[PDB]
Amino acid sequence: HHSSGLVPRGSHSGHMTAHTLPIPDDISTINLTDPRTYEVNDLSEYWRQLRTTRPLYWHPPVGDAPGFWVVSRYADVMALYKDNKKLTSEKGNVLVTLLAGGDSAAGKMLAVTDGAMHRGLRNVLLKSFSPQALKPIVDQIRVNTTRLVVDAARRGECDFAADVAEQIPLNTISDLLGVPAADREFLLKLNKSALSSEADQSATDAWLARNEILLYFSELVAERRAKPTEDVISVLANSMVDGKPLTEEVIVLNCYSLILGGDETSRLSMIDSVQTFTQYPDQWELLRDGKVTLESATEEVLRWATPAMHFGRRAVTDMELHGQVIAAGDVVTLWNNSANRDEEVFADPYAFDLNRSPNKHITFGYGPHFCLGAYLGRAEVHALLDALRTYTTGFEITGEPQRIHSNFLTGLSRLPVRIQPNEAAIAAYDSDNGVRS
Numbered sequence: 001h002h003s004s005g006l007v008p009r010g011s012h013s014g015h016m017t018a019h020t021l022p023i024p025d026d027i028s029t030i031n032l033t034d035p036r037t038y039e040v041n042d043l044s045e046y047w048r049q050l051r052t053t054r055p056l057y058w059h060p061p062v063g064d065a066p067g068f069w070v071v072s073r074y075a076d077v078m079a080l081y082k083d084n085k086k087l088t089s090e091k092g093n094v095l096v097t098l099l100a101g102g103d104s105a106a107g108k109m110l111a112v113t114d115g116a117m118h119r120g121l122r123n124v125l126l127k128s129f130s131p132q133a134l135k136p137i138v139d140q141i142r143v144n145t146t147r148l149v150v151d152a153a154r155r156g157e158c159d160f161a162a163d164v165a166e167q168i169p170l171n172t173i174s175d176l177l178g179v180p181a182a183d184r185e186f187l188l189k190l191n192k193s194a195l196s197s198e199a200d201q202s203a204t205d206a207w208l209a210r211n212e213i214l215l216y217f218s219e220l221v222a223e224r225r226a227k228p229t230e231d232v233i234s235v236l237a238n239s240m241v242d243g244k245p246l247t248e249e250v251i252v253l254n255c256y257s258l259i260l261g262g263d264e265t266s267r268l269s270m271i272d273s274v275q276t277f278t279q280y281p282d283q284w285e286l287l288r289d290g291k292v293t294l295e296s297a298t299e300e301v302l303r304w305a306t307p308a309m310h311f312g313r314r315a316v317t318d319m320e321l322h323g324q325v326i327a328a329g330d331v332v333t334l335w336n337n338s339a340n341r342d343e344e345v346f347a348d349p350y351a352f353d354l355n356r357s358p359n360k361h362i363t364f365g366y367g368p369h370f371c372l373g374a375y376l377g378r379a380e381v382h383a384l385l386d387a388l389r390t391y392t393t394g395f396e397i398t399g400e401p402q403r404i405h406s407n408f409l410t411g412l413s414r415l416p417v418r419i420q421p422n423e424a425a426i427a428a429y430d431s432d433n434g435v436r437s
Protein backbone atom coordinates (compact mmCIF):
# COMPACT_ATOMS: atom_id res chain seq x y z
CA HIS A 1 0.00 0.00 0.00
CA HIS A 2 1.21 3.51 -1.00
CA SER A 3 -0.80 5.08 1.83
CA SER A 4 -2.53 4.17 5.09
CA GLY A 5 -5.52 5.61 6.93
CA LEU A 6 -4.46 7.43 10.09
CA VAL A 7 -7.81 6.45 11.69
CA PRO A 8 -8.40 2.66 11.54
CA ARG A 9 -11.50 1.75 9.54
CA GLY A 10 -12.90 -0.13 12.56
CA SER A 11 -12.73 2.97 14.80
CA HIS A 12 -15.90 3.97 16.64
CA SER A 13 -15.10 7.69 16.29
CA GLY A 14 -12.59 10.23 14.96
CA HIS A 15 -13.54 9.66 11.32
CA MET A 16 -14.34 13.32 10.58
CA THR A 17 -10.71 14.32 11.20
CA ALA A 18 -9.09 11.33 9.43
CA HIS A 19 -6.16 11.86 7.03
CA THR A 20 -4.03 9.38 5.02
CA LEU A 21 -0.25 9.05 5.42
CA PRO A 22 2.24 7.64 2.92
CA ILE A 23 3.93 4.35 3.82
CA PRO A 24 7.51 4.89 2.60
CA ASP A 25 9.44 1.85 1.34
CA ASP A 26 12.59 3.57 0.13
CA ILE A 27 15.00 3.76 3.10
CA SER A 28 17.00 6.51 1.34
CA THR A 29 14.12 9.04 1.51
CA ILE A 30 13.75 9.08 5.31
CA ASN A 31 15.58 11.53 7.59
CA LEU A 32 15.27 10.26 11.16
CA THR A 33 16.69 13.48 12.60
CA ASP A 34 13.73 15.49 11.27
CA PRO A 35 10.77 15.50 13.73
CA ARG A 36 8.41 16.02 10.77
CA THR A 37 9.27 12.56 9.42
CA TYR A 38 7.29 10.92 12.27
CA GLU A 39 4.12 12.88 11.64
CA VAL A 40 4.10 12.78 7.81
CA ASN A 41 4.85 9.05 7.36
CA ASP A 42 3.58 5.66 8.43
CA LEU A 43 7.00 4.10 9.08
CA SER A 44 5.71 0.51 9.56
CA GLU A 45 7.15 -0.72 6.23
CA TYR A 46 10.33 1.33 6.75
CA TRP A 47 11.17 -0.40 10.08
CA ARG A 48 10.29 -3.83 8.63
CA GLN A 49 12.67 -3.16 5.72
CA LEU A 50 15.42 -2.21 8.19
CA ARG A 51 14.79 -5.28 10.40
CA THR A 52 14.77 -7.76 7.53
CA THR A 53 17.42 -6.34 5.19
CA ARG A 54 19.55 -3.79 7.09
CA PRO A 55 19.36 -4.54 10.87
CA LEU A 56 22.46 -2.36 11.39
CA TYR A 57 21.92 0.73 9.22
CA TRP A 58 24.21 3.73 8.73
CA HIS A 59 21.99 6.78 8.53
CA PRO A 60 23.84 9.45 6.54
CA PRO A 61 25.13 12.84 7.78
CA VAL A 62 22.44 15.57 7.77
CA GLY A 63 23.69 19.19 7.70
CA ASP A 64 26.61 19.63 10.12
CA ALA A 65 25.70 16.46 12.04
CA PRO A 66 27.52 13.10 11.74
CA GLY A 67 25.94 9.91 10.41
CA PHE A 68 24.75 7.33 12.92
CA TRP A 69 23.90 3.67 13.31
CA VAL A 70 20.23 2.70 13.43
CA VAL A 71 19.40 -0.55 15.23
CA SER A 72 15.91 -1.87 14.50
CA ARG A 73 15.56 -5.48 15.73
CA TYR A 74 14.27 -6.26 19.21
CA ALA A 75 17.11 -8.75 19.88
CA ASP A 76 19.80 -6.23 18.86
CA VAL A 77 18.19 -3.31 20.65
CA MET A 78 18.02 -5.40 23.83
CA ALA A 79 21.61 -6.64 23.45
CA LEU A 80 23.03 -3.13 22.95
CA TYR A 81 21.08 -1.57 25.86
CA LYS A 82 22.76 -4.20 28.01
CA ASP A 83 26.32 -3.16 27.23
CA ASN A 84 27.50 0.01 28.97
CA LYS A 85 31.16 -0.97 28.64
CA LYS A 86 31.67 -0.83 24.87
CA LEU A 87 28.84 1.70 24.62
CA THR A 88 28.47 4.88 26.70
CA SER A 89 25.69 7.32 27.54
CA GLU A 90 28.30 9.91 28.62
CA LYS A 91 28.15 11.69 25.24
CA GLY A 92 24.32 11.91 25.44
CA ASN A 93 21.48 9.33 25.24
CA VAL A 94 19.27 10.81 22.47
CA LEU A 95 19.81 12.13 18.93
CA VAL A 96 19.91 15.84 19.83
CA THR A 97 22.83 15.47 22.26
CA LEU A 98 24.55 12.55 20.50
CA LEU A 99 24.77 14.44 17.22
CA ALA A 100 25.89 17.61 19.09
CA GLY A 101 28.92 15.78 20.53
CA GLY A 102 27.72 15.60 24.11
CA ASP A 103 25.46 16.51 27.02
CA SER A 104 26.55 19.03 29.68
CA ALA A 105 24.94 16.86 32.39
CA ALA A 106 27.27 13.95 31.44
CA GLY A 107 28.78 12.18 34.45
CA LYS A 108 26.30 13.88 36.81
CA MET A 109 22.77 12.94 35.76
CA LEU A 110 21.78 9.24 35.74
CA ALA A 111 20.83 8.97 32.07
CA VAL A 112 24.16 10.37 30.84
CA THR A 113 26.46 8.70 33.44
CA ASP A 114 28.08 5.23 33.40
CA GLY A 115 30.55 3.28 35.59
CA ALA A 116 30.74 3.49 39.39
CA MET A 117 28.99 6.85 39.61
CA HIS A 118 25.93 5.48 37.74
CA ARG A 119 25.73 2.37 39.91
CA GLY A 120 26.29 4.52 43.02
CA LEU A 121 23.40 6.80 42.09
CA ARG A 122 21.08 3.88 41.24
CA ASN A 123 22.09 2.21 44.49
CA VAL A 124 21.32 5.27 46.64
CA LEU A 125 17.85 5.43 44.99
CA LEU A 126 16.94 1.71 45.34
CA LYS A 127 15.02 1.96 48.63
CA SER A 128 13.01 5.01 47.39
CA PHE A 129 11.77 3.11 44.34
CA SER A 130 10.84 -0.19 46.04
CA PRO A 131 7.13 -1.14 45.77
CA GLN A 132 6.92 -1.07 49.57
CA ALA A 133 8.25 2.52 49.65
CA LEU A 134 6.09 3.59 46.70
CA LYS A 135 2.83 2.28 48.21
CA PRO A 136 1.66 5.70 49.55
CA ILE A 137 2.51 7.26 46.17
CA VAL A 138 0.62 4.54 44.26
CA ASP A 139 -2.34 4.98 46.61
CA GLN A 140 -2.42 8.67 45.78
CA ILE A 141 -2.12 7.99 42.04
CA ARG A 142 -5.40 6.06 42.33
CA VAL A 143 -7.12 8.84 44.28
CA ASN A 144 -5.84 11.57 41.98
CA THR A 145 -6.55 9.67 38.75
CA THR A 146 -10.04 8.66 39.86
CA ARG A 147 -10.90 12.28 40.77
CA LEU A 148 -9.72 13.54 37.33
CA VAL A 149 -11.57 10.87 35.34
CA VAL A 150 -14.76 11.26 37.35
CA ASP A 151 -14.69 15.07 36.92
CA ALA A 152 -14.08 14.75 33.15
CA ALA A 153 -16.91 12.13 32.78
CA ARG A 154 -19.25 14.49 34.66
CA ARG A 155 -18.58 17.30 32.13
CA GLY A 156 -18.66 15.15 28.98
CA GLU A 157 -16.67 17.29 26.50
CA CYS A 158 -13.01 17.82 27.46
CA ASP A 159 -9.40 17.72 26.27
CA PHE A 160 -8.16 14.46 27.71
CA ALA A 161 -4.53 15.70 27.64
CA ALA A 162 -5.09 18.99 29.55
CA ASP A 163 -7.93 17.89 31.84
CA VAL A 164 -6.69 14.44 32.89
CA ALA A 165 -3.24 13.40 31.67
CA GLU A 166 -1.35 16.66 32.43
CA GLN A 167 -2.53 16.63 36.03
CA ILE A 168 -1.13 13.18 37.00
CA PRO A 169 2.63 12.69 36.35
CA LEU A 170 3.88 15.95 37.91
CA ASN A 171 1.85 15.20 41.06
CA THR A 172 3.31 11.68 41.22
CA ILE A 173 6.82 13.05 40.75
CA SER A 174 6.19 15.87 43.24
CA ASP A 175 5.06 13.32 45.84
CA LEU A 176 8.19 11.30 45.11
CA LEU A 177 10.48 14.35 45.50
CA GLY A 178 8.58 15.72 48.51
CA VAL A 179 7.46 18.92 46.76
CA PRO A 180 4.87 20.64 49.02
CA ALA A 181 1.25 20.88 47.83
CA ALA A 182 1.54 24.70 47.82
CA ASP A 183 4.46 24.68 45.32
CA ARG A 184 2.96 22.28 42.76
CA GLU A 185 1.18 24.90 40.65
CA PHE A 186 4.34 27.05 40.87
CA LEU A 187 6.39 24.03 39.66
CA LEU A 188 3.78 23.07 37.01
CA LYS A 189 4.07 26.35 35.08
CA LEU A 190 7.87 26.15 35.05
CA ASN A 191 7.89 22.60 33.66
CA LYS A 192 5.51 23.52 30.80
CA SER A 193 7.69 26.37 29.52
CA ALA A 194 10.90 24.35 30.10
CA LEU A 195 9.82 21.84 27.42
CA SER A 196 10.07 23.61 24.02
CA SER A 197 7.30 24.58 23.45
CA GLU A 198 8.13 26.15 20.07
CA ALA A 199 10.73 30.76 18.13
CA ASP A 200 13.35 32.82 20.01
CA GLN A 201 11.23 33.71 23.06
CA SER A 202 10.13 30.09 23.60
CA ALA A 203 13.72 28.73 23.52
CA THR A 204 14.69 31.58 25.88
CA ASP A 205 11.79 30.83 28.25
CA ALA A 206 12.72 27.11 28.20
CA TRP A 207 16.27 27.58 29.55
CA LEU A 208 15.15 30.22 32.06
CA ALA A 209 12.43 27.90 33.42
CA ARG A 210 14.83 24.93 33.69
CA ASN A 211 17.27 27.19 35.56
CA GLU A 212 14.49 28.28 37.97
CA ILE A 213 13.53 24.64 38.65
CA LEU A 214 17.15 23.79 39.56
CA LEU A 215 17.31 26.81 41.85
CA TYR A 216 14.12 25.73 43.62
CA PHE A 217 15.44 22.19 44.04
CA SER A 218 18.65 23.68 45.42
CA GLU A 219 16.50 25.37 48.09
CA LEU A 220 14.82 22.09 49.02
CA VAL A 221 18.24 20.39 49.21
CA ALA A 222 19.39 23.00 51.76
CA GLU A 223 16.20 22.39 53.79
CA ARG A 224 16.64 18.58 53.75
CA ARG A 225 20.27 18.89 54.86
CA ALA A 226 19.14 20.97 57.86
CA LYS A 227 16.07 18.75 58.47
CA PRO A 228 16.09 15.34 56.67
CA THR A 229 12.89 13.67 55.42
CA GLU A 230 12.22 10.33 53.67
CA ASP A 231 11.69 11.83 50.17
CA VAL A 232 14.06 11.52 47.18
CA ILE A 233 15.56 15.01 47.60
CA SER A 234 16.54 14.22 51.19
CA VAL A 235 17.89 10.79 50.21
CA LEU A 236 20.17 12.34 47.55
CA ALA A 237 21.16 15.29 49.82
CA ASN A 238 22.08 13.11 52.79
CA SER A 239 23.72 10.24 50.93
CA MET A 240 27.33 9.42 50.23
CA VAL A 241 28.65 7.46 47.26
CA ASP A 242 32.11 5.80 47.29
CA GLY A 243 33.38 7.99 50.15
CA LYS A 244 32.04 11.38 48.95
CA PRO A 245 28.80 13.34 49.36
CA LEU A 246 27.03 14.22 46.08
CA THR A 247 27.71 17.75 44.77
CA GLU A 248 24.87 20.27 44.75
CA GLU A 249 24.77 20.05 40.94
CA VAL A 250 24.49 16.23 40.89
CA ILE A 251 21.62 16.20 43.42
CA VAL A 252 19.63 18.96 41.68
CA LEU A 253 20.18 17.50 38.20
CA ASN A 254 19.00 14.06 39.29
CA CYS A 255 15.94 15.56 41.02
CA TYR A 256 15.13 17.31 37.74
CA SER A 257 15.76 14.13 35.73
CA LEU A 258 12.72 12.55 37.43
CA ILE A 259 10.58 15.29 35.83
CA LEU A 260 12.49 15.03 32.54
CA GLY A 261 12.16 11.25 32.39
CA GLY A 262 8.74 10.78 33.94
CA ASP A 263 6.46 13.69 33.12
CA GLU A 264 5.99 13.75 29.31
CA THR A 265 6.43 9.99 28.62
CA SER A 266 3.78 9.12 31.25
CA ARG A 267 1.38 11.70 29.76
CA LEU A 268 1.96 10.46 26.24
CA SER A 269 1.29 6.83 27.24
CA MET A 270 -1.99 7.74 28.99
CA ILE A 271 -3.16 9.97 26.13
CA ASP A 272 -2.26 7.24 23.63
CA SER A 273 -4.44 4.70 25.46
CA VAL A 274 -7.55 6.86 24.99
CA GLN A 275 -6.99 7.48 21.29
CA THR A 276 -6.22 3.76 20.81
CA PHE A 277 -9.44 2.66 22.56
CA THR A 278 -11.50 4.79 20.17
CA GLN A 279 -9.66 3.10 17.30
CA TYR A 280 -10.13 -0.44 18.63
CA PRO A 281 -13.51 -0.36 20.39
CA ASP A 282 -13.62 -4.17 20.74
CA GLN A 283 -10.56 -3.87 23.00
CA TRP A 284 -12.19 -1.06 24.97
CA GLU A 285 -15.23 -3.30 25.50
CA LEU A 286 -12.98 -6.12 26.77
CA LEU A 287 -11.43 -3.76 29.31
CA ARG A 288 -14.67 -2.03 30.40
CA ASP A 289 -16.48 -5.31 30.95
CA GLY A 290 -13.78 -7.04 33.01
CA LYS A 291 -12.76 -9.54 30.30
CA VAL A 292 -8.99 -8.92 30.54
CA THR A 293 -6.88 -8.03 33.60
CA LEU A 294 -5.65 -4.50 34.22
CA GLU A 295 -2.18 -6.00 34.36
CA SER A 296 -2.30 -7.47 30.87
CA ALA A 297 -4.01 -4.38 29.44
CA THR A 298 -1.38 -2.08 30.99
CA GLU A 299 1.47 -3.93 29.25
CA GLU A 300 -0.22 -3.73 25.84
CA VAL A 301 -0.90 -0.02 26.24
CA LEU A 302 2.83 0.42 26.95
CA ARG A 303 3.90 -1.68 23.95
CA TRP A 304 1.39 0.13 21.72
CA ALA A 305 2.30 3.67 22.84
CA THR A 306 6.15 3.30 22.96
CA PRO A 307 6.41 7.07 23.67
CA ALA A 308 10.24 7.17 23.70
CA MET A 309 10.97 6.08 20.11
CA HIS A 310 14.74 5.83 20.51
CA PHE A 311 17.63 6.04 22.90
CA GLY A 312 21.25 6.20 21.86
CA ARG A 313 24.83 5.58 22.80
CA ARG A 314 28.31 6.24 21.52
CA ALA A 315 30.87 3.47 20.90
CA VAL A 316 33.73 3.45 23.43
CA THR A 317 35.57 0.82 21.41
CA ASP A 318 35.17 -0.93 18.05
CA MET A 319 32.46 -3.57 18.05
CA GLU A 320 31.10 -6.03 15.48
CA LEU A 321 27.44 -6.60 14.73
CA HIS A 322 25.90 -8.20 11.66
CA GLY A 323 29.27 -8.59 9.93
CA GLN A 324 29.88 -4.88 10.20
CA VAL A 325 32.13 -2.72 12.39
CA ILE A 326 30.83 0.02 14.67
CA ALA A 327 33.84 2.26 15.22
CA ALA A 328 34.95 3.92 18.45
CA GLY A 329 33.26 7.32 18.47
CA ASP A 330 30.27 6.33 16.25
CA VAL A 331 26.77 7.29 17.34
CA VAL A 332 24.48 4.28 17.86
CA THR A 333 20.64 4.59 17.96
CA LEU A 334 18.24 1.96 19.39
CA TRP A 335 14.69 2.13 18.08
CA ASN A 336 12.18 0.95 20.65
CA ASN A 337 9.27 1.67 18.36
CA SER A 338 10.62 -0.79 15.74
CA ALA A 339 11.55 -3.36 18.45
CA ASN A 340 8.01 -3.19 19.82
CA ARG A 341 6.65 -4.06 16.34
CA ASP A 342 9.21 -6.83 15.57
CA GLU A 343 7.14 -9.81 14.31
CA GLU A 344 10.04 -12.11 15.25
CA VAL A 345 9.12 -11.40 18.90
CA PHE A 346 5.48 -10.19 18.88
CA ALA A 347 2.95 -12.28 16.94
CA ASP A 348 0.71 -10.01 14.83
CA PRO A 349 2.56 -6.95 16.16
CA TYR A 350 0.13 -4.39 14.63
CA ALA A 351 -2.77 -6.04 16.44
CA PHE A 352 -3.75 -4.07 19.58
CA ASP A 353 -4.44 -6.97 21.96
CA LEU A 354 -5.04 -6.32 25.66
CA ASN A 355 -4.75 -10.05 26.40
CA ARG A 356 -1.36 -10.29 24.63
CA SER A 357 0.94 -12.89 26.10
CA PRO A 358 3.82 -12.95 26.17
CA ASN A 359 4.41 -9.19 26.12
CA LYS A 360 8.01 -8.38 26.96
CA HIS A 361 7.96 -5.01 25.23
CA ILE A 362 11.02 -2.73 25.56
CA THR A 363 9.14 0.52 26.23
CA PHE A 364 11.14 1.08 29.47
CA GLY A 365 14.49 0.10 27.96
CA TYR A 366 16.90 -2.48 29.33
CA GLY A 367 20.28 -2.99 31.00
CA PRO A 368 21.95 -0.60 33.48
CA HIS A 369 19.79 2.43 32.57
CA PHE A 370 16.48 0.53 32.60
CA CYS A 371 13.77 3.11 33.45
CA LEU A 372 14.10 4.13 37.10
CA GLY A 373 10.37 4.96 37.12
CA ALA A 374 9.02 1.86 35.28
CA TYR A 375 6.96 0.76 38.31
CA LEU A 376 5.42 4.22 38.55
CA GLY A 377 4.84 4.51 34.78
CA ARG A 378 2.95 1.20 34.94
CA ALA A 379 1.00 2.36 38.05
CA GLU A 380 -0.19 5.52 36.26
CA VAL A 381 -1.39 3.60 33.20
CA HIS A 382 -2.90 0.90 35.48
CA ALA A 383 -4.76 3.54 37.54
CA LEU A 384 -6.03 5.29 34.42
CA LEU A 385 -7.34 2.02 32.91
CA ASP A 386 -9.05 1.17 36.20
CA ALA A 387 -10.67 4.64 36.37
CA LEU A 388 -11.81 4.47 32.72
CA ARG A 389 -13.28 0.98 33.05
CA THR A 390 -15.10 1.86 36.32
CA TYR A 391 -16.43 5.40 35.73
CA THR A 392 -16.98 5.60 31.95
CA THR A 393 -18.94 3.48 29.45
CA GLY A 394 -17.10 4.96 26.47
CA PHE A 395 -15.66 8.01 24.77
CA GLU A 396 -15.26 9.54 21.33
CA ILE A 397 -12.85 11.85 19.51
CA THR A 398 -14.55 15.23 19.06
CA GLY A 399 -11.82 17.18 17.25
CA GLU A 400 -8.49 16.75 15.58
CA PRO A 401 -5.74 15.39 17.81
CA GLN A 402 -2.44 17.31 17.76
CA ARG A 403 0.96 15.56 17.66
CA ILE A 404 4.02 16.66 19.63
CA HIS A 405 7.05 17.49 17.46
CA SER A 406 10.11 15.38 18.28
CA ASN A 407 12.61 12.93 16.79
CA PHE A 408 12.81 11.37 20.25
CA LEU A 409 9.30 11.26 21.71
CA THR A 410 6.06 10.58 19.91
CA GLY A 411 2.41 11.15 20.78
CA LEU A 412 -0.32 13.74 21.40
CA SER A 413 -0.36 17.10 23.17
CA ARG A 414 -4.12 17.51 22.60
CA LEU A 415 -6.98 14.96 22.46
CA PRO A 416 -10.54 16.44 22.29
CA VAL A 417 -13.01 13.83 23.55
CA ARG A 418 -16.51 13.39 24.89
CA ILE A 419 -16.70 10.86 27.72
CA GLN A 420 -19.86 8.85 28.45
CA PRO A 421 -20.21 8.60 32.26
CA ASN A 422 -21.02 5.35 34.08
CA GLU A 423 -23.83 7.04 36.04
CA ALA A 424 -24.31 4.30 38.63
CA ALA A 425 -20.56 4.17 39.39
CA ILE A 426 -20.29 7.96 39.72
CA ALA A 427 -23.37 8.03 41.96
CA ALA A 428 -21.73 5.55 44.34
CA TYR A 429 -18.48 7.61 44.21
CA ASP A 430 -20.45 10.79 45.05
CA SER A 431 -22.60 9.08 47.70
CA ASP A 432 -22.19 10.25 51.31
CA ASN A 433 -21.78 6.70 52.58
CA GLY A 434 -18.03 6.25 52.78
CA VAL A 435 -16.65 4.85 49.55
CA ARG A 436 -14.72 6.95 47.04
CA SER A 437 -12.14 5.26 44.80
Ligand code: HEM
Pocket residue numbers: 089093110111112122173176257258259261262263265266269306307308311312362363364365366368369370371372373374376377378
Ligand atom coordinates in the same frame (compact mmCIF):
# COMPACT_ATOMS: atom_id res chain seq x y z
C1 HEM B 1 5.57 5.31 30.32
C2 HEM B 1 6.40 6.24 30.81
C3 HEM B 1 7.94 6.05 30.74
C4 HEM B 1 8.69 5.65 29.69
C5 HEM B 1 8.26 5.22 28.27
C6 HEM B 1 10.07 5.67 30.09
C7 HEM B 1 11.13 5.26 29.33
C8 HEM B 1 12.43 5.19 29.74
C9 HEM B 1 13.51 4.55 29.06
C10 HEM B 1 13.35 3.78 27.75
C11 HEM B 1 14.64 4.73 29.79
C12 HEM B 1 16.07 4.25 29.45
C13 HEM B 1 16.88 5.43 28.88
C14 HEM B 1 18.24 5.03 28.33
O1 HEM B 1 18.57 3.81 28.31
O2 HEM B 1 19.00 5.94 27.88
C15 HEM B 1 14.30 5.52 30.94
C16 HEM B 1 15.16 5.93 31.93
C17 HEM B 1 14.86 6.70 33.02
N1 HEM B 1 13.58 7.00 33.49
FE1 HEM B 1 11.85 6.48 32.45
N2 HEM B 1 10.13 6.08 31.41
C18 HEM B 1 8.85 6.35 31.84
C19 HEM B 1 8.51 6.78 33.11
C20 HEM B 1 9.38 7.32 34.05
C21 HEM B 1 9.01 7.90 35.32
C22 HEM B 1 7.56 8.01 35.85
C23 HEM B 1 10.14 8.32 35.94
C24 HEM B 1 10.29 9.04 37.29
C25 HEM B 1 9.88 8.51 38.45
C26 HEM B 1 11.25 8.01 35.07
C27 HEM B 1 12.57 8.30 35.32
C28 HEM B 1 13.64 7.82 34.61
C29 HEM B 1 15.04 8.07 34.94
C30 HEM B 1 15.62 8.90 36.11
C31 HEM B 1 15.83 7.33 33.88
C32 HEM B 1 17.36 7.21 33.75
C33 HEM B 1 17.73 5.93 34.54
C34 HEM B 1 19.20 5.62 34.32
O3 HEM B 1 19.80 6.24 33.43
O4 HEM B 1 19.78 4.77 35.04
N3 HEM B 1 10.76 7.37 33.95
N4 HEM B 1 12.94 5.75 30.90
